[PDB]
Design a protein around this ligand. Structure first.
Ligand SMILES: C[As](C)(=O)[O-]
Length: 451
């Protein structure tokens, strides 16, 4: 039996999670973003050819994708298409990847709902606007519905749902994305991530998703900084780390190993899976990138030389968009030889070396009882205006929920909305919710700031 975020996930999904954890320390799966949709040696793509396959002889073990496909911003998604047809093309590539024998993972560089800009547009205060009760919350819900559609469309010909590692709101420790650290307190981020899990799982019924959380990189092995944004054991299956470098220096490598063993330890302690969710040469390996000498093998060596840092299930590098920006070396790139050596190394696993990932029979541990206040989120700023307090109680039968605004200037009696939260209108420092449930009396406290 294993601790899995979706206690009622399909058998294949539970199996993948089991497989990923057992692979740790034994071998690491190599992954590549848009491996069959973007390539410099493949010619027009159709989801069946890859630069990785062409330069190493085998497809990557992990096929990474992104909701930008749905938006029609990245192939096979097309600008002219409706999100529904893009979704159809998206599922087709996942099915094909599954057929080839790889594991699928989906990240989400979500469009800025407020400005109409990209994921890089950090103006608009979009993170708070997208939180439950926010002005553009309905926009996020609709976006998540399309993802739920994608999850449902990802099925083998026999109808079996294809498992997918979903990794939303990544690299939030930095501020280059609108869901970054400068646009929302750690608490606001946690509610965004938590809502995303609950909405897809508890409201849409998605059951072939494994949830990954990777706040970024360069934590120097500091558990406290790494977990400051942590969504919680009940919301994460895979603990990630995103790190790029163009120096190849011993300092970089030392820092990397520190970070990699940190997540492996946290993972083992919690009985979860850890993985090098994103890695690569900064700026890529092409024209606008760099060619650190033997970067791939040096990084691999450092990883497998450490018994703890090697306990990570997979490592995915980025897409091969064009000559100026690509992460997997192709003929003409100085790092090609080194990358091929990295691929030939016994410790790195590719598609053909991944078998029986979805054939294991593991039981899902019962869902753990949790209670959290979706609004106002911890760390949020509350204006004098009228708001709604919403509390989420999952993994157990709830009879009642109460909230006390201390500083006890108020006491509210909530009512279930009949899908997700227990709410009550509130007209404005400490907000504590107490829910009388079958698992007993559960409470949680959020500290908010007044405007
Ligand atoms: C390649 As990225 C924007 O996920 O760091």
């Amino acid at each position: 039996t294993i601790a899995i975020v979706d206690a009622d996930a399909t058998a294949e999904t539970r199996s993948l999670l089991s497989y990923l954890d057992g692979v740790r320390g034994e071998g690491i799966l190599f992954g590549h973003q848009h491996t069959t949709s973007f390539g410099l040696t493949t010619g027009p793509t159709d989801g069946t050819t890859s630069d990785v396959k062409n330069v190493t002889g085998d497809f990557p073990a992990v096929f990474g994708w992104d909701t930008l496909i749905i938006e029609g911003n990245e192939r096979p998604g097309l600008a002219e298409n409706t999100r529904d047809e893009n979704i159809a093309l998206f599922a087709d590539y996942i099915r094909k990847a599954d057929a080839i024998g790889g594991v699928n993972t989906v990240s989400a560089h979500v469009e800025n709902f407020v400005t109409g800009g990209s994921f890089y547009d950090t103006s608009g205060d979009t993170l708070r606007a997208v939180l439950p009760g926010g002005s553009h919350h309905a926009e996020l819900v609709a976006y998540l519905d399309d993802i739920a559609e994608l999850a449902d469309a990802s099925r083998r010909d026999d109808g079996t749902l294809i498992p997918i590692v979903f990794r939303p709101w990544h690299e939030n420790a930095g501020s280059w994305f609108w869901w970054g650290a400068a646009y929302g307190s750690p608490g606001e981020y946690q509610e965004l991530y938590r809502f995303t899990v609950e909405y897809l799982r508890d409201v849409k019924g998605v059951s072939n998703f494994l949830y990954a959380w990777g706040p970024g990189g360069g934590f120097g092995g500091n558990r406290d900084v790494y977990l400051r944004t942590y969504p919680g054991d009940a919301f994460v299956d895979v603990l990630g780390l995103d790190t790029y470098d163009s120096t190849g220096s011993d300092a970089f490598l030392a820092g990397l190993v520190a970070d990699l063993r940190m997540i492996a330890e946290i993972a083992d302690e919690k009985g979860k899976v850890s993985a090098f969710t994103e890695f690569g040469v900064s700026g890529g390996v092409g024209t606008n990138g760099s060619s650190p000498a033997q970067w791939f093998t040096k990084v691999l060596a450092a990883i497998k030389a450490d018994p703890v840092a090697s306990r990570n299930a997979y490592m995915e590098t980025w897409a091969n968009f064009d000559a100026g920006q690509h992460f997997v070396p192709v003929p003409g790139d100085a790092l090609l030889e080194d990358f091929q050596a990295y691929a030939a190394d016994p410790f790195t696993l590719f598609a053909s070396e991944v078998t029986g990932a979805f054939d294991r029979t593991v039981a899902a541990a019962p869902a753990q009882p949790v209670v959290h206040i979706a609004s106002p989120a911890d760390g949020a700023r509350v204006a004098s205006a009228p708001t709604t307090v919403r509390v989420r109680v999952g993994g157990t039968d709830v009879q009642s929920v109460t909230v006390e605004v201390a500083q006890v200037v108020d006491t509210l009696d909530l009512a279930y909305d009949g899908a997700l939260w227990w709410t009550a209108p509130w007209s404005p420092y400490t907000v504590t919710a107490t829910a009388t449930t079958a698992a007993g009396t559960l409470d949680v406290t959020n500290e908010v700031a007044a405007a």
